[PDB]
Each structure stands twice: as C-alpha cells, then as structure tokens.
Design a protein around this nucleic acid. Sequence first.
RNA 1: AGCGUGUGCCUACCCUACGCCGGCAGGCGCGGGUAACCCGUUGAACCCCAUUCGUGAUGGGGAUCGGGGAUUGCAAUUAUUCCCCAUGAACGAGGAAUUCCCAGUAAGUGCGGGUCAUAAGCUUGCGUUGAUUAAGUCCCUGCCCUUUGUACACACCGCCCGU
RNA 2: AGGAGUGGAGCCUGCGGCUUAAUUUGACUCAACACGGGAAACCUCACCCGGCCCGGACACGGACAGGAUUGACAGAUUGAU
Lengths: 68, 120, 55, 69, 96
Amino acid sequence: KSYTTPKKNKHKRKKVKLAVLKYYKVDENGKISRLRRECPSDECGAGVFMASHFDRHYCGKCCLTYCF
Amino acid sequence: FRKFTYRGVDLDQLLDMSYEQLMQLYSARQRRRLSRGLRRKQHSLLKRLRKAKKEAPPMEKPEVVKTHLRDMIILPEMVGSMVGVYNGKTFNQVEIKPEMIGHYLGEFSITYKPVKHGRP
Amino acid sequence: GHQQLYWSHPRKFGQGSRSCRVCSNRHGLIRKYGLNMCRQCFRQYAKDIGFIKLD
Amino acid sequence: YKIPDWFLNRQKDVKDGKYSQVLANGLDNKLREDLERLKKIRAHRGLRHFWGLRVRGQHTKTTGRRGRT
Amino acid sequence: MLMPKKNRIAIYELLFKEGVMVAKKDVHMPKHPELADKNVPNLHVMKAMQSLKSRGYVKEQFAWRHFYWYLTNEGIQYLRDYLHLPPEIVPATLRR
RNA sequence: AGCGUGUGCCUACCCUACGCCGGCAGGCGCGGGUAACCCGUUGAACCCCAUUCGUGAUGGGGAUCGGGGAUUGCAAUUAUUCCCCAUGAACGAGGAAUUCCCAGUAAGUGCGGGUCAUAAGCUUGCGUUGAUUAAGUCCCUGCCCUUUGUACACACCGCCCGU
RNA sequence: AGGAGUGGAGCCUGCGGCUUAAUUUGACUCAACACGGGAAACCUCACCCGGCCCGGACACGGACAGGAUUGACAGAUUGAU
Ligand SMILES: [Zn+2]
C-alpha cells in the first residue's frame, strides 16, 4: 500500500509499433539492406542484430560490448 | 607545525612505497589481510572505492562519497579525503588525517549512543 | 544481478552449512556420527533407529 | 649486548620504528601522549579511555562496580 | 515463471517414461542431482509440478525433505494430449 | 590411567607420528588409520626427590592496561583465539542468611564427548589420590495417615447475621 | 554430629532496571534466572535502518506471435558491476 516512502515504479517497456518492419529497407528491388551490424559470435545467432545507440552498438543475450 | 612520520619515513615516501613492503611496514593483523590474496572474491566494492578515491577533483574541499563499509583498512593512497561510513542509521563524517592510517574506519565512527542514566 | 547476488554469503562454514533432515530447523543439531538432525525429532524417532533404554 | 629483539617490551613504535626499552617516567609519558593522541584523533578506544569505561571489549552490566559512586 | 521450454519438455519426456520422480525441498540448489546431463533448476521443477497439482494431474506427499509425485491415468491422457503421441506407447508403470 | 574421539550423500571442516626453521604460538615437506594394528605402551595431572624463597599485599594473587608476532574465515574494530615482554588494583579467610553430602563417598586434581571453520569459566562422563562424623530424631522445614467437629459440597478463595 | 562451602574480593554468564532508532521474546518460590542443548563477529534472527526478485498456484474477464515481458552498456544514484 501507499506508505511514507514512495515506491519507484517498474520499468514499463513502451509498446513500439512497426519495429519488425524497421529492420530492412524497402526498395524497388527485392534485396535486403539492414541498418544494424550483424553478430559474428556464436552466442547470438546470425539473424540477431545489435542495438541502435548514439555511439556504440550492443548485443542482446551475448552481453558483449564492441567499441570502435 | 611538527613534522609527521610513520616508523621513520615521510608521507611522500608512503605514497611512493608499495604493498609488498607496506605489509612489513604495517602490523601483523593488517598485513594478514593484505597477504590473503586478491580483492575480488567480495572486495569489488573495495576496488571501485579505491577508484572513486583515485579520481581527483581540483583544489577545493575533497569530494564526499558515503560508504556502507566498516571493515576498511585505511591506506595512505586516500589520505585527506571526505568520507562518512554507514553506522546502521546515518553516516558519521570524519576528515581523513595523515595519522589516521593504521586503523579501521568503523573503529573511528561511533555507532551506539553513550549511555546516560536518570532514575531507575 | 539478482541471480548473482542471490548467493553472496557462502555456506562453506558456520551454523548455516547444515540443518535438520526431518523438521528442517537449524537448532539442536547432532553432528555426532553424522546424524545431522535435531534433538526433538531424535527423541521422536530414536526408537526406530535402534536406540534403546539400557542405562 | 646481544639480547634478542623480541624480548623487549615496546616494538615498532609509531614515532621511530626501532626496537628499544622504556624508563618509568618514559613509560608514564608514552602512555600519556598515547592518551591525548587517541583523544585528539577521536577514536572509539579514545572515547572509552576518556570515559574511563572498559576499552578491551568486555561486559559492564554486572561487573565494573567500582566505576563511580 | 519466466522458465524455458526445452527443460520442461525434457521433464515431461522423463515423466512419460516413468511417472514418478523425487525432488528434495531446497530452493538454494541450482542443479538437479539425477538430471545432471543438462543445466536444470529445482525450484522451477517443483513449481511446475505444483502447477500440475493445481490442475489436478498428480497428488503430493511430503515426508521429510522430499516432494513425492504420483502419475494418474487422467494425467497419462493429459500427457498424451500435450505431447501429442498416438495411444500405442504406455508408461512402464502399467506394463508387466 | 580410563571412558572415549578419529577423512563426511547434501559437504568442504578427520586424528596424527616422523624430519627441518623459529624463544614461542606456528610454517613446509614426509607416512599410517576407515580403525585393539596409526596417533598410543594414549610416558596425564596430583604426588615424590633436590635447590631457591622467608611472614613483608611479598617470588601470593594476575584484575586492568600498551606494543609486537602467528592460525582459522569473505570480513576480527565493540581486543575471535593464542604467544612474548612490560603494567601488579581489590584481597589478611567475609555480617544477616543459605546449599550439598554417608565409602572409593565428599573433596583436591587431570583427561574425553557435546558446543566447534576458529572453541570452554557450561554440561555429561572417565580416571588418580582419598578422608572427619552417624547407624538416629520429628526440634526446625515439608509430606502422608488415623481420630474428632462441620450450619462446607463451585467445598474456607466456603457459607452466613444485622444497621 | 560433622565435612565442603556459598553469600565477602576480582573475573565469566543470565535476569531485572536504565539506556537504545533496536538493545527481540518466553521462562518469576520450590517446580525460571550457565534455561530453550541460546559459548549470538557475517547466516543464526524472530530487532532497527535500508534495496531488489516473486516464490500472486491458479478460475473468470480485458491483451495476444504485428509482440505479454525478463536479461544490460558510456554516467547522476544508495551499497554493490
Ligand atoms: Zn552478440
């Protein structure tokens, strides 16, 4: 219940839409053009992308940071 | 105005002299903690605390980093700091002296109130 | 990490390394001959072990 | 005169670190600047020595009746 | 209940071969002793079988420190429905 | 001398001889035992023999306190424990009052088990030496039984009179 | 009739009281007070100050693979990467 100490809420992940349609680029040709670099490790699969940050791209379940 | 020394050597030498001779400079109980091994089984917070004391602000009053540690052996690397250790409820603030070395930080912080007495 | 902070106190030693094998309480244990089991359940099931009233 | 170093009473002093003996006035003096050294560095042992209670970490609830009136 | 899939169907196929298993009550135990070939927990295992208790497929006895589970014929046909096997292989409890 | 104890399902903490280093607590190699075999003939303490001490809060008593050194554990400060040197208080057999005890018994000692990672001022046993007094009483303190009286039966913490 | 004593001195332990943000509680004549096999550095822990996880099995009704949510990185952040 509401006590004297306020409770910090949990991380509400906002439901984003058209994310799966945002991987590749749609052109006249049927070829693929993704904007995220591929994962060369064996911990995460070949279809697993990176994150899209401002400075550095981060894995998922690999939890590996590749800087520049 | 009197000069300060620790067993014949001065504080610049203390920051110049390393751990494998700091063990023989210090007492037997202090060097047994140093000679037990790496500070990584539980002392990852100790490593990040010595990093947080290694980062250097410019010439003002030293930075305030409160801590949840009382079993710290205080070292000459972080003398002249500004630190308050956990006392169960609050943080007792003690400015770090140069003769502050050789003891425990939780030793230097009072935890229980001194006992007063009125009427039984 | 909760999954790495869940085991931060090792039970290599101390009173927490063992408990009762019947009532699962960490008091009145018998370490003699490896019983590892509390005294009241020892009195309850002592006849079933083979322990007898002779002295 | 070829005596063992460990047989001395005071070893590894904070002032000089060399092994030496002490005199009666010297022992009284060394104990007293130890007293205001702890009092001025503001430690728990210093406060216990200042209050005159037990400093070696023992009980006081039942024992220690000759503390004050 | 953020528990994986392949470990649970491993538990289910070792249940379909023999409908009884034993598990000691220990939350602070990351490894199952009998199922040492692959990384499996124990608390998720006993929570899965008490979910089967809530569904009404097994019955539970707790003697000293071990939870005991017993397979029913209605639990057998539930296993047949969930695993989608034809009714020609039977768990070895019913066989001679 | 005698009870003992001694390498583990979860579990990893067992008991040790021998050989060097160090005053010391302790450090490193080296074997035995899943146990009448190895610790272990468990060379225990007390006691005995020969000096020193000399009635003085003293070589009795070791509380309090400072420094140094080792082991356990992730961590010892509010000293975990031990070792070494200094520090040497009260205490001259304790008022009223009160407890335990009849033969290997009380008592003086030491050794095992539980507690235990480090571990005994507690408890349970083992062993050494080993007495004074008594073969009774209801005085004290309680218990039990008989007789007697009862206007009591929820039973004296009872019933019950009058303003 | 005796013997050992306790109560006297110092020290260990428990209880009461006082104190404490907390000094957790039971046990008050035999028949409680070195008792809970309770010699508490951390777990013990039941006490205080602080922060996460669910371990809400599930029955129904809102949501469903187009995403219902956990697992993390330069850095303010307690206390911790
Ligand atoms: Zn990756």
